[PDB]
Design a protein around this nucleic acid. Structure first.
Length: 861
DNA sequence: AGGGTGGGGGGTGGGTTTGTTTTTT
DNA sequence: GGGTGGGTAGGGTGGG
């Protein structure tokens, strides 16, 4: 027999057996004999202040503290451009200010406008509002400005900041408000014209954030209605002319920066000076990227490497003319798919012996490289004494390793920091002088066709290289090392892809309609680098299925509440159903956690211990979002004992104190909006009146399934075959796997063979980052279109033509009819919210449904 | 994303993870 | 080579 014939036929025999085994593993759905009678019976019934500011400023000029602080402000490069910055702003409506690193344009341009208005006399008719891209940056900048003017932030002074759940608002007339980009967008709902604001300043707009792009376009549109409004942009050199052309060829400023001189060494220079010989047998390559990445640029990437291959032979010949032959072969036979950790380890060794005192900071793409490099350094004998200290940096590290990096060190310590791209944004070490830049960064994309979000490693853009280089020469002259040849440095991308072209455009689509800006499709055409038509059409269609939008995008009453809730549309529906079923407190904690981070932090050395503690918190719920509730519940009880007990609890279970505190403040915000709508009767999320079904884990799982319904996976289990194995499938993805960080990674005793996930990614294989099992009743009611069929087994009932259970015809008919009554009741309740009373006979469909979910179940199959 | 108790027919088949950032009154 | 490793994540120009 042919080899292909026997192999192909063998699959058919195995495939038939597998199909014939899944049909016998379907869960049976039946309730009772007495319960059916109850359901059937119910179903049959269906002026002087302006001048006072000038006097106050003159009096403050004699303060000793103010004079001392003013002397330092003179050294800033932006001080010399005070005449030009103030005069041009008062003339043109739109101005662009571009400056290199070192000039304090963020803390000086804002003060220049206020000082000019106060001195000229009409200083009470201005209100400068400055937008910052980070919560920490807003706080730090405001405090620095307050100390510069010899005042205190907030408390009715001339400066302040406002962020989420924290606002030290200054006085009304004059004053400066530093707020994140999100705050300004929320203001547009009340007053779309942004009145009572004289100057609006947008800084750090070169990062091309998601919310920054929306605000910039809205301001441009609003400019016509408000001729007297002045808006100032702040880019960072490079491609600063793009913003000028967008706004209509506005004037530009080129404020020079200030930085100590630095020297840049490429791959050829580093190898030649340190004489690095690669290890033998290390050239064994791997699969040549057998993934076929579907990135947005795709063809742009395919093009750039084409020139690189073409110019490769020419560049190599020129290199041999200058450098030695030994270094030429090393750079030629170097893998470009991964950073050479051996080269970095050798480079750090050379710096210690030869170069002078300083701090070394190295950028790495991800955790895998951070843990690998830390092993190479710790393995060697030299990097083990008390002299050298290594402080890894990552988001998952406990409180970014506290404040060890901030503290200075005596001579000889030579602290070494291994960090991801978290240190380049805002970490303020203020001590490093040698910077090693592994030219690889991790980017998150989104495929409009596969409807999945991937994550891979990409070469750093020319802007990222400049940002990393600028962290060395700030307080002392230093050195910057780049791990790529001169050919790569010329072919690097000028900028990263804007966030508007990546990430799903789901929350942004609802934000457009709540602001009455346009028609979603028309508004997403004046944005710089507008998204592709495929992504816009898919987002609208997905919202239509969720029923957040009408047949002609009219913002159905359900969608109104989703837009005003600062969460994703899927998460927002979970919050709304939590108040309807009176399971408020546990649901709010899950929604807050799903919206922003988890309170679990894993240190470097202890990775296996951290996973063991997380499984202990899960108890026997076989759930991932229920561990957050269990962790939060324990933390609250521990805090009652005392402050000392709370610290011990977080350390024992590797929890994060700051994240848990933020999650507690987020819960109160959600309940405040619900009270205004009318779903609840109090602002306290832990109201005993609205926490009736709060101690039941079955009701909570049903509510979660109501929110994240379309994401459902199968737990098809293969019996035997040595150790037990579980294969997880998806309707549109084929075969997926559970991420090792999840609780259910190694679980093989699932009561029901179904899951619900929230976040999935295609880093290397399709992964589910969190999943919880669901009973069949949780899918029958809060699911798709119920259908009754017959496939020679029984009166099988399907919710989406692929989720199939087993039930008799009589029972299945009752369940389908009950679902129809619930949908009508649920729609009416959302349109006219009410606290709902559990001591009446008006609409008891919810009461009957709760009894079915709470009781019965226990299929265990 | 299968085992090493198949076999080393090939590695151009595959053999566990983990950029950061944001939201009125 | 095996077939309970998979052909809904390998291939037959790898073998039976």
């Amino acid at each position: 027999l042919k080899g292909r014939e026997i192999g192909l036929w063998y699959a058919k025999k195995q495939g038939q057996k597998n199909k014939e085994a899944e049909r016998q593993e379907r869960a049976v759905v039946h309730m009772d004999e007495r319960r059916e009678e109850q359901i059937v019976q119910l179903l049959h019934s269906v002026a002087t202040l302006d001048q006072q500011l000038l006097e106050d400023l003159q009096k403050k000029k004699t303060d000793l503290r103010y004079i001392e602080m003013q002397r330092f402000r003179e050294k800033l490069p932006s001080y010399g451009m005070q005449k030009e910055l103030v005069n041009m702003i008062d003339n043109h409506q739109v101005t662009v200010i571009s400056g290199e690193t070192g000039c304090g344009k963020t803390t000086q341009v804002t003060q220049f406008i206020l000082d000019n208005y106060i001195e000229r006399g009409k200083g009470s008719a201005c209100r400068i509002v400055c937008t910052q891209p980070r919560r920490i940056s807003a706080i730090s900048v405001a405090e620095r400005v307050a100390a510069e003017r010899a005042e205190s932030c907030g408390n009715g002074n001339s400066t302040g900041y406002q962020i989420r759940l924290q606002s030290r608002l200054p006085r009304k007339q004059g004053s400066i408000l530093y707020c994140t980009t999100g705050i300004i967008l929320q203001w547009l709902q009340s007053d779309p014209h942004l009145s009572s604001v004289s100057h609006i300043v947008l800084d750090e707009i070169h990062e091309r954030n998601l919310q920054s792009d929306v605000l910039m376009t809205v301001v441009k549109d609003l400019l016509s209605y408000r001729p007297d409004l002045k808006v100032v942009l702040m880019s960072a050199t490079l491609n600063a002319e793009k913003f000028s052309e967008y706004f209509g060829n506005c004037p530009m400023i080129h404020i020079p920066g200030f930085t100590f001189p630095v020297v840049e060494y490429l791959l050829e220079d580093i190898i030649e000076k340190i004489r690095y010989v690669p290890e033998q047998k290390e050239h064994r390559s791997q699969f040549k990227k057998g993934f076929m990445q579907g990135h947005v640029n795709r063809q742009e990437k395919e093009e750039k490497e084409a020139i690189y291959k073409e110019r490769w032979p020419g560049y190599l010949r020129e290199l041999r003319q200058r450098y030695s032959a030994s270094t030429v072969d090393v750079v030629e036979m170097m893998d470009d798919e991964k950073v050479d950790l051996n080269l970095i380890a050798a480079l750090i060794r050379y710096i210690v012996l030869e170069e002078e005192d300083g701090a070394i900071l190295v950028f790495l793409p991800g955790w895998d490289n951070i843990s690998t490099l830390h092993d190479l350094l710790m393995s060697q004998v030299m990097f083990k004494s008390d002299k050298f200290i290594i402080i890894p940096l990552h988001s998952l590290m406990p409180t970014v390793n506290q404040t060890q990096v901030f503290k200075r060190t005596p001579p000889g310590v030579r602290k070494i920091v291994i960090a991801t791209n978290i240190a380049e944004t805002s970490i303020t070490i203020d001590d490093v002088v040698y910077v090693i830049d592994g030219g690889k960064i991790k980017e998150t994309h989104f495929d409009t066709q596969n409807n999945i979000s991937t994550m891979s490693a990409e070469w750093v853009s020319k802007a990222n290289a400049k940002q990393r280089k600028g962290r060395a020469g700030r307080v002392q002259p230093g050195h910057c090392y780049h791990l790529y040849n001169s050919l790569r440095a010329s072919l690097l991308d000028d900028y990263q892809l804007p966030e508007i072209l990546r990430t799903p455009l789901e929350e942004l689509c609802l934000q457009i309609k709540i602001l009455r800006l346009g028609g979603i499709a028309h508004f997403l055409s004046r944005l710089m680098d507008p998204p592709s038509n495929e992504a816009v059409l898919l987002s609208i269609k997905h919202l239509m299925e969720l029923n957040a939008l009408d047949k002609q995008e009219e913002l159905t009453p359900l969608g109104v509440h989703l837009a005003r809730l600062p969460v994703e549309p899927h998460i927002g529906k979970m919050i709304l159903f939590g108040a309807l079923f009176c399971c408020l407190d546990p649901v709010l904690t899950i929604a807050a956690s799903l919206s922003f981070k988890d309170p679990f932090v894993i240190p470097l050395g202890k990775e296996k211990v951290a996973d063991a503690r997380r499984k202990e918190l899960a108890k026997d719920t076989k759930s991932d979002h229920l561990t957050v509730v269990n962790a939060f519940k324990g933390w609250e009880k521990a805090k009652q004992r005392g402050f000392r007990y709370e610290k011990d609890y977080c350390w024992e279970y590797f929890l994060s104190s700051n994240t848990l505190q933020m999650l507690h403040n987020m819960k109160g915000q959600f309940a405040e909006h619900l009270l205004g709508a009318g779903f609840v009767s109090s602002r306290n999320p832990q109201d005993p009146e609205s926490n009736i079904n709060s101690d039941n884990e079955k009701i909570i799982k049903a509510v979660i399934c109501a929110g994240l319904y379309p994401k459902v996976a199968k737990i098809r289990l293969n019996l035997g075959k040595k150790r037990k194995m579980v294969k997880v499938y998806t309707k549109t993805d084929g075969v997926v796997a559970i991420h090792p960080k999840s609780v259910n990674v190694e679980q093989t005793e699932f009561n029901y063979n179904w899951l619900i996930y929230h976040l999935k990614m295609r880093t290397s294989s399709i992964y589910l980052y969190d999943c919880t099992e669901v009973s069949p009743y949780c899918l029958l009611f809060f699911g798709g279109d119920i259908s009754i069929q017959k496939d020679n087994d029984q009166e099988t009932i399907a919710v989406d033509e692929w989720i199939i259970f087993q039930s008799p015809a009589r029972i299945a008919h009752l369940v389908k009819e009950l679902r129809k009554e619930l949908d009508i009741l649920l729609q009416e309740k959302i349109e006219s919210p009410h606290p709902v009373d559990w001591k009446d006979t008006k609409s008891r469909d919810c009461a009957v449904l709760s009894a079915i979910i709470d009781l019965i179940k226990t299929q265990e199959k």
